[PDB]
Design a protein around this ligand. Structure first.
Ligand SMILES: O=C(O)c1cc(O)c(O)c(O)c1
Ligand SMILES: [Fe+3]
Ligand SMILES: [Fe+3]
Lengths: 405, 408
């Protein structure tokens, strides 16, 4: 319900790399870490419950299937593998509920989304988070990551990123729970990391862009990919993600911090923004918005034997649904059938989930949070046939059931 | 550039977990008029709207996943790859369609190289003769109807609406059909399993064809009650009807409800809009190229557009697996034996073997696959950059303020 402010920070793997190598003593790296100090401490004082974390993934967890606004709805996130194995970092926790409320308001506001769980976070996330948050135990806050498809064009327009941030504020503000939320926009600034133009930077544009983002962000919304990549490098045009975070903050903000360093490929920059509230009650109240967000599923309760696959349900059901989804892999059913206890013992299903499968408990799995298309798969591995699954859903048997056609 | 009209049709899997009888004969006969309209109207491409039933799309799940790839095999749904010939996609039409949609502020997804399930392959193995291949090419719009929140019906409608002028603006006069394939009324889960409603089914089909804007207020609830929970996927039908003329001509319609799912079918013929469109289909083309216009004036830069993703897909996908520890293990130890099993052409293999960094960028490898390949190999990002710049590492490091090295 309460947005405290937002920070902007580069997401270069060099940040992760210099940290892991512990070069806080290093001539080059030392003043750069001192550049993160105001954000690190602010985050340690204000103590947000969740960081809504805008970043892009770097063809690691997103490639064969690649989406624009992909909202992490999962209960927890782990460092991804990038060819050198996962970093020595603990899993950071999610916020399925807050993710769920944001999901609902954004669809109401006509943004087409995508939801995902289980998949690691690469340097886009864990490079700066590793340096902004302490973690030799567990992370101090939760996260609702929002991974943006900025690498495969055509991608959303600059104004579309901004407008996303605009709805994002109203959703987060209308969350009827008493929490501090910060908003992160990661990536940039100037850099190009491919082709003969690799090496490119533009300190002047970087400074002009940061000042405009802070004090006149609407002046950037006419920016094309061509503009942003001419002035900032091809991969520097990922700064549209900074427009998104900026769009989620009060129209005016108190720019508490700005730092800039350009050791190597990437202009490593950092902004801290203090939210200045609402100098005017919203055009649509918090109450009205919660209405309109629930509207499409208003009533749905009053329909028996109906267990909609909402996001809470999907998160609840993710381990069982993922395991049953593995049936489409040929080798999987060559241990789901020959040796179902071995697959079980080597899996991470709670024992309750194993007994549900074991008993073929069809409507019991629908009750638990198994989607039927994961059962459709199950009934065509060991047995079984749809008429069976449909009958057990009403406790009937095949003959009595078949009497409707 | 010409929409010949399109059809709406059910996509139940029993039309293939069976099919390939006297109960069936009048059901198939519901499909064969459209079938002959598809061998007589001769479509070059079929923009085919459907939904994956949690085969291909799951752990990561999208609302409008445009298929951009050059070829689709049928998805394994738990019971093996169903013996069908790989159907052809149309990347260049997908690319152009994506460009207009983004300009109209629709957030998309793009995918390649994953199976199509019964949601596509099944009802098409009825409308399309498929001896050793298929009549046309397909642009698969996988929709995300299985996990709420999902886009409002008015949003599915506008998509199809924008999708219309986007296909009309394709500069190539070929023949395009459209196929919103869903439903009809049913419910395949819960104590409510087996529900139907032939008195909404008929009201719905008639309104969709003759007063479809009278469905833009349907909530999920209104739709789920009046037709089942899974039935409410007909919101896809509104997309297809969205992409047709306001006034159409319901050429044909069938309806047979054997078991669980109400099997419907609608044949529309496109007429032609009321006067010209408000945006000329050349000015549209301009607006759809706006974001990347003049990008060719940027030197040493190779944008990663759809055409490049399609062109780079094999070598990009192959390199992407360096994140898999057991793959990259081999890649260091047994490169050629890995190369053999892979589907990489000889040049792709050579590019990798010769560590031709500049070559891979030009060819279509996105940089972030080389960042991994560098890491896997023990060298770092810098060596790649220097190589891009035709400079030695020290000579390139000179161009930087400080000299740092890094990986992973
Ligand atoms: O080499 C870099 O500075 C660099 C490498 C990356 O993969 C990246 O995403 C980035 O923002 C910067
Ligand atoms: Fe990035
Ligand atoms: Fe369906």
């Amino acid at each position: 319900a309460k947005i405290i402010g937002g920070f902007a920070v580069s997401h270069t793997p060099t940040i992760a790399f210099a940290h892991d190598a512990n070069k806080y003593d290093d001539p080059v790296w030392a003043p750069i870490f001192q550049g993160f100090e105001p954000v690190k401490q602010w985050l340690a004082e204000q103590k947000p419950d969740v960081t809504f974390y805008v970043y892009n993934d770097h063809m690691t967890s997103f490639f064969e299937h690649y989406s624009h606004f992909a909202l992490g709805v999962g209960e927890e996130y782990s460092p991804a593998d990038e060819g050198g194995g996962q970093r020595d970092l603990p899993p950071i926790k999610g916020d399925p509920e807050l993710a769920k409320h944001i999901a609902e308001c954004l669809v109401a506001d006509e943004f087409d989304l995508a939801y995902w769980q289980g998949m690691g976070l690469d340097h886009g996330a864990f490079s700066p988070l590793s340096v902004l948050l302490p973690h030799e135990h567990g992370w101090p806050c939760r996260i609702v990551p929002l991974q943006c498809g900025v690498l495969q064009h055509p991608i959303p327009k600059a104004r579309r990123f901004w407008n996303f941030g605009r709805s994002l504020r109203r959703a987060i503000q209308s969350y009827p729970r008493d929490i501090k939320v910060a908003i992160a926009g990661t990536g940039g600034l100037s850099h190009q990391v491919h082709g003969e133009r690799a090496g490119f930077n533009n300190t002047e544009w970087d400074m002009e862009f940061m000042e405009r983002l802070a004090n006149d962000p609407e002046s950037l919304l006419g920016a094309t990919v061509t503009d942003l990549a001419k002035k900032g490098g091809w991969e520097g045009a990922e700064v549209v993600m900074w427009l998104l975070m900026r769009g989620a903050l009060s129209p005016e903000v108190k720019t508490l911090h700005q730092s800039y360093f350009l050791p190597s490929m990437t202009a490593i920059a950092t902004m801290l923004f203090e939210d200045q509230g609402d100098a005017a009650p919203p055009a649509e109240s918090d109450e009205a918005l919660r209405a309109r967000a629930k509207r499409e599923l208003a009533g749905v309760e009053e329909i028996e034997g109906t267990y909609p696959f909402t996001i809470d349900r999907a998160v609840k059901g993710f381990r069982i649904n993922h395991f049953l989804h593995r049936l489409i892999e040929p080798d999987f059913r060559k241990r789901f059938v020959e040796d179902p206890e071995g697959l079980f013992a080597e899996s991470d299903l709670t024992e309750e989930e194993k007994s549900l499968i074991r008993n073929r408990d069809w409507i019991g799995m629908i009750h638990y949070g198994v989607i039927f298309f994961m059962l459709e798969k199950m009934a065509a591995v060991l047995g079984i046939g749809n008429i069976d699954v449909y009958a057990a859903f009403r406790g009937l048997s095949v003959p009595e059931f078949q009497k409707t056609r």
